[PDB]
Amino acid sequence: NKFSASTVHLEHITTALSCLTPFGSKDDVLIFIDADGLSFVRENNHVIKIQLLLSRELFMSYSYRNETEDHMKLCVKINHILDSVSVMNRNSDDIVECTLSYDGHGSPFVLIFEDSFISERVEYSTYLIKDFDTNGLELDRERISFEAIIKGEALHSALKDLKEIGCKECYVYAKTEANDENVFALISKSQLGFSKIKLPSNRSILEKLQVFDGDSTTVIDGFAVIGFFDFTSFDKIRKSTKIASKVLFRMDVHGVLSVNILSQPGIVIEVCMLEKESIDEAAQTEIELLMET
Amino acid sequence: SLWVDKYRPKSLNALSHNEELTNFLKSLSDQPRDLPHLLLYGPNGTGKKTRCMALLESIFGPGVYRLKIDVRQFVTASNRKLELNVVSSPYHLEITPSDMGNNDRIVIQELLKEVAQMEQVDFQDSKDGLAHRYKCVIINEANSLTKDAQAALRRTMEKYSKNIRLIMVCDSMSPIIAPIKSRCLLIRCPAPSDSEISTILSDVVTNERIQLETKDILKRIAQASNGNLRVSLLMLESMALNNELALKSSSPIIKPDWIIVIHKLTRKIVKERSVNSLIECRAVLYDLLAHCIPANIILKELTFSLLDVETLNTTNKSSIIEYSSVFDERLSLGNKAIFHLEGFIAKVMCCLD
């Protein structure tokens, strides 16, 4: 086979799948196979994209004997995989050794679950790949306006609070005061009114907040970047922050938020999100007034 | 039981009303392996179902008359329990998809496709067999299939012809689409002559003594039955029990009540031709329709009763038949029958006046 990967820590590939479901529960999922690792990419409405990566170090054997091409792309349905690996996971306490396989274009995606007695073999049909390219929804790495490093538990609690208060729309405030103060907040529009969640300036929750003038080099103080986001897209990372040790937030002047989630080796999750128009330009001033309040 | 079922021919050699048809059925049943799909058409009550059962008895042997009713359940697009009785035999199945309405497409697409997908392998028998290999499905009243159940059958009985065969009973095979008639062997069943009906009634009154005064009373029933053996055998039993098992030459022939009401309506139309008479005719038509009598038969009997009036000239009758044809075409392509059934009567009274 052109690709073969074997593992026993199936909980890793199970949490990786559980991080993909938020981005739609029945659609196509793109799998990129290269020598470095196995990555799943999912895009919803051309406004948000998630890219997890399973490194070769998470597998004992990672052959990838494909030589004609450096990387292999396949498109399969996520509902087939989720409906499959659910009933397989009935006796997950058994010592199962998952074996991923792909023999090239036109061949199915094989997922063998052997228990040293039973060798379940599931072949997933591969579909044609759509026109949209996942490299369009990426931040420009020379235009970063703010770069915040936050813990996983605090961000997960903030997202769960925003979910419980409804949060139809969300705002992100990032200002670095001149003296020593760093301000990072998640302001929300909801049924309640205008609610704000303030991450502490202490270095255990907010390890590093750095605001630039749209070039990721010139650190300035007294100016805040504000990102208007739809919480439907912003809640897609909530299931990924649940297993996150640290979360890296980066945004450019083009209105793209790149959420970087690293879990502990482990799965590397990259979620890119687009920012709304904000055609009304009074909520911006009200955000400024609220933060100064 | 009734004399129609008690004195029913249960074999191909017991048929005694058409001999050029019985020989063709024997030719078909001589080699049953290559029996094609059959479509028996002819007047009602001629004995088409009796001949189908006799052919099945000749093919699969006795026991095809051992009928049991297995109640089925179906679900359409919007969840709704639709029920269809399936009279079944160890060698054949009888279904009436018209009894379930416009949703006979789901019955044809599920029950018939599931039956046609089962190979009926039984014990080994993977090579062939005269019986028990292929299956016979009888679709009674094939005319009332709503042009969509007839589309789901074209490939069903063509692709699965090895494990299923269809024998559908119908009358006046006009509403049957051309592709269905193309895949099938057309079998015409003519009505018995008055002599043959009289002979059958003579056999019935010989086996059961009704004390026949004259052989003419059996001929009068045959002429009043218009070729319907079941109707003739029903009137025989009616005038038998209503005359203490003693038929006289003066015994009146008992006709169905709706036919008498249609004749009364015809006489009312001939006598009175006005708007209020039209409203009374609408009430009579509504009463007739409340008894689940099909509207095409109401129009047919009304027309052929109006054409029997001796006080109507040829110009009136030639217009009555034209209006009957026009409103029959309108009724076929329609939703509510009262509009056409009232328009025909209104035009008839507007022409006779």
Partner: protein
């Protein structure tokens, strides 16, 4: 073993007779790989289904057929959801790898075929949801629409599908195929027979094959070793005998309403089909030289109206009586 209509179904494209304008085009696609979207339309029993079943076999083989063919007919649901999900996902599917035996024996084109037989029964919305499905995935999935009435297929779908008209199979283009089946089954027929069968079966070879099989099943049941005559074929095809038709036209010529009504009443009991007696009256009246131009012009429209009313599923007795009364007053 099996009915002759299923025993003599064309297995390859060289067994499909009388349709060369489409089979010649389809055979060229075996060497090439540019099969277009196809719309097979024509009279019933002309060979539209057999042609696509033979083309599919000759293109893929029995092993690759199960993976490269999706066939949907009127026997399964083909609503808006089915078209937008199942057909779209099958078109979006990747072309399966042909085996070494498949690639060494069969052409194995790099696409799959979706066969939508009886496409005239599909709604206008399910057909509308197919246009971009065929256009977007045309390089990986081909479509074959089979129908009898091309008017029931929407114009946007008919434009995207190459139209192949299957001609009616008459006695001039199906006589060799019928003679072949007669010879292999050892059927003895008189001269003139096997042409009367194709004349009664107007443009339908399936009905003619079934008619010949039914004639043979009586011929070997009689056990006299005599050739099948045209009289028996007409008797078992439902054709009204000429004496009865002459009686009908003689009753019509008199013009008395009551005698024609009584004759039609005693004729409907014999079980004859109205579409057959109307057709026979058409041949009797149009080809006869004893009628003027006006009579033929009127009766052509009368027969057309009667046939159109009969095709809609109406009472045969009323339509036949009205037609004969109208001819009696012409």
């Amino acid at each position: 073993q099996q009915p002759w209509v299923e025993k003599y179904r064309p297995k390859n494209l060289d067994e499909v007779t009388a349709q060369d304008h489409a089979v010649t085009v389809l055979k060229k696609t075996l060497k090439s790989a540019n099969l277009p979207h196809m719309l097979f339309y024509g009279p019933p029993g002309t060979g539209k289904t057999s042609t696509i079943l033979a083309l599919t076999k000759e293109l893929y083989g029995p092993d690759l057929m199960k993976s490269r063919i999706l066939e949907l007919n009127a026997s399964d649901e083909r609503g808006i959801s089915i078209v937008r999900e199942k057909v779209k996902n099958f078109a979006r599917l990747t072309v399966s790898k042909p085996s070494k035996h498949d690639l060494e024996n069969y052409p194995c084109p790099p696409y799959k075929i979706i066969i939508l037989d009886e496409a005239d029964s599909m709604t206008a919305d399910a057909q509308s949801a197919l246009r971009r499905t065929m256009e977007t995935y045309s390089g990986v999935t081909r479509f074959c629409l089979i129908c009898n009435y091309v008017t029931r297929i929407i114009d946007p779908l008919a434009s995207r599908c190459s139209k192949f008209r299957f001609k009616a199979l008459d006695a001039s283009n199906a006589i060799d195929r019928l003679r072949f089946i007669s010879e292999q089954e050892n059927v003895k027929c008189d001269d003139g027979v096997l042409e009367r069968i194709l004349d009664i079966s107007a443009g339908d070879l399936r009905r003619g094959i079934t008619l010949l099989q039914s004639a043979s099943k009586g011929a070997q049941y009689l056990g006299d070793g005599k050739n099948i005559t045209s009289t028996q074929v007409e008797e078992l095809a439902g054709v009204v005998p000429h004496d009865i038709l002459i009686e009908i036209v003689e009753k019509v010529k008199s013009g008395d309403f009551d005698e024609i009504k009584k004759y039609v009443n005693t004729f409907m009991k014999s079980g004859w089909s109205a579409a057959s007696v109307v057709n026979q009256l058409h041949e009797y009246y149009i080809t006869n030289d004893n009628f003027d131009t006006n009579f033929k012009n009127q009766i052509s429209w009368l027969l057309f109206t009667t046939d159109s009313r009969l095709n809609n599923g109406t009472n045969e007795h009323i339509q036949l009586l009205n037609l004969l009364v109208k001819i009696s007053q012409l």
